[PDB]
UniProtKB/Swiss-Prot annotation:
Subunit organization: Monomer.
Listed result of changing F100S: About 25% decrease in activity
SUPFAM superfamilies xref list: Glycolipid transfer protein, GLTP
Tissue expression pattern: Detected in fibroblasts (at protein level). Detected in fibroblasts and in various cancer cell lines.
Protein name, as recorded: Glycolipid transfer protein
Annotated consequence of substituting H137L: Almost complete inactivation; 1-3% residual activity
Originating species: Homo sapiens
Length: 205
């Protein structure tokens, strides 16, 4: 996780597209080791969105040099169908997935737990879901999340699995905290960009 740290934000707070995509492309493969095929569709959404942004980038790397470039170029390119199109739509959903992971990991690191059930991660996942995704899901997908939550491993197994090497839980969590610095900062900047460009949509799925 901290082997693929995101770069820091530059002074102008512009996020270069290519390095950003390389960095977040290391996140999906962790889903293969949470111990359930319930996570396969989740990996596909995140990866699928990464792939969609990459494919738009590849058609003109200079024009789409930054994430900001993408939104303003596509706004101009598409007119009325924007922002519900292209890389802008893919990144709208990617950000919510990345924020989910962010909120989840930070909750874990901050020592949040169910006193009654200390070695589960359900309360952590549930907070992340409420903060990042829930308001954009209709009742059917929300019910599916509630089912999928039971596929979550134990906290100990989860942390040990990320340490995939010979390291204490405390050490592992300090590495996660390190990863979270630039990760959170970058996602914040993407969320701010959506707000300023008025590119955020609230439709539910
Ligand atoms: C550099 C971006 C590569 C696209 C990978 C898509 C799956 C995470
Ligand atoms: C990349 C780890 C994801 C946990 C939700």
């Amino acid at each position: 996780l901290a082997e693929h740290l995101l770069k820091p934000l530059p002074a102008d707070k512009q996020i270069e597209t290519g390095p950003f995509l390389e960095a977040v492309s290391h996140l999906p493969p962790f889903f293969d080791c949470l111990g359930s095929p319930v996570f396969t569709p989740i990996k596909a959404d995140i990866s699928g969105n990464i792939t969609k942004i990459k494919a738009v980038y590849d058609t003109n790397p200079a024009k789409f040099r930054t994430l900001q470039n993408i939104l303003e170029v596509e706004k101009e390119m598409y007119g009325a169908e924007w922002p519900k199109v292209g890389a802008t739509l893919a990144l709208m959903w990617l950000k919510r997935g990345l924020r989910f992971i962010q909120v989840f990991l930070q909750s874990i690191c901050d020592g949040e737990r169910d006193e009654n059930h200390p070695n589960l991660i359900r309360v952590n996942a549930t907070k992340a879901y409420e903060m990042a995704l829930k308001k954009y899901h209709g009742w059917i997908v929300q019910k599916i999340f509630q089912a999928a939550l039971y596929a979550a491993p134990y906290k100990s197994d989860f942390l040990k699995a990320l340490s995939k090497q010979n390291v204490t839980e405390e050490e592992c969590l300090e590495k996660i905290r390190l990863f979270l610095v630039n990760y959170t900062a970058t996602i914040d900047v993407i969320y701010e960009m959506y707000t300023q460009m008025n590119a955020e949509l609230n439709y539910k799925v």
